[model samples]
Target chain A: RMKQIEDKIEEIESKQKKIENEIARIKKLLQLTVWGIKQLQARIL
Target chain B: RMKQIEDKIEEIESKQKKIENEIARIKKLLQLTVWGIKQLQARIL
Candidate 1:
């Protein structure tokens, strides 16, 4: 196996990119929705 | 640290979209599966 730091770094990088992609997709959906903000609130509740 | 929750929501939304896409993909794949030659080929060596 590799060093722990390297493994953690790679993990962080993958997750970070995945998180970014999520933000991008959510932004697109929000843009497409007329009540995006309201829907988000409803979802949270 | 202060913005952790907002970032987490962003992350969750990303996973949500990814999962939704996968569900749609699986459904489409199942629908398009043929039951004759294609099915046989899928199970054979």
Candidate 2:
């Protein structure tokens, strides 16, 4: 039972990391847009 | 013992949805930015 619990925890940790990495990637993608907006704003100003 | 395992599974499911919602939000933000890029490209072309 204890080992089972540990395995469950490890699985959870692994999945958490998977989603977290995706979140990081999405953030990076959004940052590109932000950079583009700043460039446009600079042009306008 | 079985109840405990079920509870753990439920927790993971809930956490999974939480991240899934975040992923959706990030995708929407990215899509909007992509649209901006398309508009800019149209202007240039």
Candidate 3:
């Protein structure tokens, strides 16, 4: 039981990294979104 | 057995997604609250 998931943990992590790495370019998009929201708030008040 | 982890993949991902989404939501909430704080400060000005 314990070893079962343990074995798959590496594969799961690998898949997660693969998927997230593909989305790496969007990371700055997230940062810019938050940055823009903050700048908007600055203008609002 | 190899089947144990396979059987629980959906369950694991469900739980992980729930927890991760909650954490992400809370983080964004905090980030947005910064604007609320700024507005409250402006009220004092």
Rank candidates by DockQ, best first.
2, 3, 1
Instruction: For residues B2-43, write the lDDT of model 1, one tens digit per residue.
Output: 265447556766776876776576455444433322444555
Q: What are the candidates' individual DockQ scores? A: 0.02, 0.31, 0.10
| CAPRI grade, predicted model 1 | incorrect
Q: Choose the strongest candidate by TM-score.
A: 2
Q: By summed lDDT, which 10 consecutive residues of candidate 2 chain A come out lowest?
A: A36-45
- lDDT of the candidates, in the order given: 0.55, 0.79, 0.63
- Native contacts conserved, per model: 0.00, 0.29, 0.00
Clashes of each: 1, 0, 0
Write model 2 residue lDDT over A1-45, tens digit each, in one string.
778786977788797988789789869868977798769857854
* lDDT (Cα, 0-100) at A10 in candidate 2: 74
Q: Give the RMSD in angstroms, all C-alphas superposed, for model 3.
A: 7.6
What's the true lDDT of residue B11 in model 1? Answer: 71
- List the candidates ranked by lDDT, beginning with the highest: 2, 3, 1
Q: Per-residue lDDT tens digits of candidate 2, residues B1-45?
A: 667777877887888888888888887887888787777667765
**Which pairs, if any, clash in model 2?**
none
Candidate 1 regions exceeding 4 Å error are: A1-45, B34-45
Give the runs in model 2 whose Cα sits over 4 Å from its true position.
Answer: A1-9
Q: If you assessed candidate 3 against the hidden native complex, which CAPRI class would it receive? A: incorrect
